[PDB]
Amino acid sequence: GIEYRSLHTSQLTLSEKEALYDLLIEGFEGDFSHDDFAHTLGGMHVMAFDQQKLVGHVAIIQRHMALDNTPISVGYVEAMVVEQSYRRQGIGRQLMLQTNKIIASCYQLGLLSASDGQKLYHSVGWQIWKGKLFELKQGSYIRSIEEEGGVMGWKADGEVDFTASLYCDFRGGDQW
Amino acid sequence: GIEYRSLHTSQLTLSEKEALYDLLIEGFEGDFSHDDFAHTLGGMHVMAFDQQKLVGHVAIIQRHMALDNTPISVGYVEAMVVEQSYRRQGIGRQLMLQTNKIIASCYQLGLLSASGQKLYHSVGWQIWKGKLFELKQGSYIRSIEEEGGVMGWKADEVDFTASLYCDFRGGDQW
Ligand SMILES: CC(C)(COP(=O)(O)OP(=O)(O)OC[C@H]1O[C@@H](n2cnc3c(N)ncnc32)[C@H](O)[C@@H]1OP(=O)(O)O)[C@@H](O)C(=O)NCCC(=O)NCCS
Ligand SMILES: CC(C)(COP(=O)(O)OP(=O)(O)OC[C@H]1O[C@@H](n2cnc3c(N)ncnc32)[C@H](O)[C@@H]1OP(=O)(O)O)[C@@H](O)C(=O)NCCC(=O)NCCS
Ligand SMILES: CN[C@@H]1[C@@H](O)[C@@H](O[C@@H]2[C@@H](O)[C@H](O[C@H]3OC(CNCCO)=CC[C@H]3NC(C)=O)[C@@H](N)C[C@H]2NC(=O)[C@@H](O)CCN)OC[C@]1(C)O
Ligand SMILES: CN[C@@H]1[C@@H](O)[C@@H](O[C@@H]2[C@@H](O)[C@H](O[C@H]3OC(CNCCO)=CC[C@H]3NC(C)=O)[C@@H](N)C[C@H]2NC(=O)[C@@H](O)CCN)OC[C@]1(C)O
């Protein structure tokens, strides 16, 4: 074998963008919205190819969040997918190892919302976020109760309080 | 010549990041903070080279803002600089032309805070007419100083008279 490429959205060919969309719809068995695809664009993509065919993907989006009262730069992991017949071969793990490298070089903290999918992320050093989660709804921050226990975080240095509150920035669709 | 290269922050070595810092400090005559440099990192860099010598740069950072009540994905332009002896030759214009292409392919709106605005206007950018808000002490406040300084580029429409609420960061919010 599998070839891996790290490409910003601006560096994708039009062909690669359409393959990616198809891969995400197929890999999530349709449970992937237009908002979810919008969240996948604008940052870095790690893509896995079997020769010329796209078979795996993860994206890393820059988000601007607050850790308690402190601003933090976040590499937010979106749209992790491997084509069904290529699964359970370690592609997803390699995508995450490359993801960790990107986060370590650019952002203060990695974050993601898992599935069922937690064991893979835990195997490359990610941990469940234990503090409160907040999102903007109708103007002001509310608790993201549904997501608490599902969001996972990662720091290279490990020097971050996983019990602290996280306030995420405003976007369409699912905030996490 | 001048060669132009577009690299994500994760595609840069330590020396190239250091060359970028030095260019920014020199080009802004020291009026560029450690926070300003943090704002420069994490997105796309358009860089101009005379041979192996970095002589120009602009960054495009993804930001998540609200246009009035609606969320808007923003390519935010940071750290536009050309080395002093290379100015008034078209490099800044070419850096903005590459910037526009990146914004057009990734984001709904391009934004920046200027400091002359003629260059940006020459490449399609327009002064933002709506109120601007930033966070201070956890509550949004009129970015009164910024209003009239922030410019937008439509990635095309977006109503430039709507209120913009920027997302939270260290240092200057705009
Ligand atoms: C989640 C997903 C990307 C995992 O991709 P993957 O390529 O199968 O990932 P890996 O092969 O690295 O790991 C998958 C499993 O096979 C194991 N494995 C690792 N290397 C292996 C190898 N050489 N041979 C066999 N199995 C291996 C892993 O330990 C892991 O075990 P687990 O499921 O019990 O935790 C994939 O299942 C997928 O696309 N799901 C649909 C979309 C989705 O849910 N994305 C995640 C949302 S958070
Ligand atoms: C802002 C900055 C990047 C411009 O870079 P630049 O390479 O000089 O940009 P350009 O050469 O494309 O255009 C600048 C001017 O030179 C003119 N110009 C361009 N090529 C020219 C040429 N061959 N002959 C004569 N004039 C020319 C342009 O018409 C333009 O005129 P204007 O300012 O009245 O609009 C540079 O001044 C700088 O680094 N300033 C320090 C950083 C700063 O203060 N602010 C960051 C911007 S918000
Ligand atoms: C804590 N319980 C969880 C749910 O909460 C829900 O977690 C959602 C989460 O997977 C989504 O991330 C992945 O899934 C898809 C698309 N899938 C939804 C179809 O649009 C996009 C990116 C994926 N991530 C990666 C790394 O690839 C998050 N984007 C949103 C999470 N939240 C919700 O959907 C609800 O709160 C809706 C309220 N607005 O799933 C599983 C769960 C354990 O039961
Ligand atoms: C509208 N009047 C303006 C002021 O408002 C102020 O505009 C600031 C603006 O240039 C800054 O962007 C540029 O400057 C630097 C370095 N900046 C100085 C060292 O930190 C970083 C990136 C630059 N942009 C690009 C595209 O490269 C913005 N980041 C912030 C703007 N606001 C302020 O500085 C003050 O309101 C608060 C400061 N505590 O100066 C210029 C002005 C026209 O007079």
Residue numbers in the entry:
A (entry chain A): 2 to 116, 118 to 178
B (entry chain B): 2 to 116, 119 to 159, 161 to 178
From the article:
However, a newly developed aminoglycoside antibiotic, plazomicin (marketed as Zemdri), was approved for clinical use by the U.S. Food and Drug Administration (FDA) in 2018; and since then, sister agencies in other countries have also approved its use. Chemically, plazomicin is derived from sisomicin, an aminoglycoside that closely resembles gentamicin, with synthetic modifications incorporated at the N1 and N6′ positions of the antibiotic. The N1 position is extended by appending a hydroxy-aminobutyric acid (HABA) substituent, and the N6′ is modified through the addition of a hydroxyethyl (HE) substituent.
Crystals of AAC(2′)-Ia were grown in the presence of the substrates plazomicin and acetyl-CoA. However, discovery maps unequivocally identified the enzymatically modified plazomicin and CoA in the active site in each unit of the dimeric structure, indicating that the acetylation reaction had occurred during crystallization and that the product bound state of the enzyme was captured. The pattern of hydrogen bonds between AAC(2′)-Ia and acetylated-plazomicin reveals that the majority of interactions occur at the central ring and the prime ring, the latter being the site of 2′-aminoglycoside modification. The Ser114 interacts with the 2′-amine, while residues Ala80 and Met81 interact with the oxygen of the 2′-acetyl modification. The N1 HABA tail extends away from the central ring in a solvent-exposed region, though the N1 secondary amine moiety forms hydrogen bonds with Glu149 and Asp176. Modeling of the inactivated plazomicin into the ribosomal A-site reveals that the carbonyl group of the additional acetyl moiety would inevitably cause steric clashes with O6 and/or N7 of G1491.
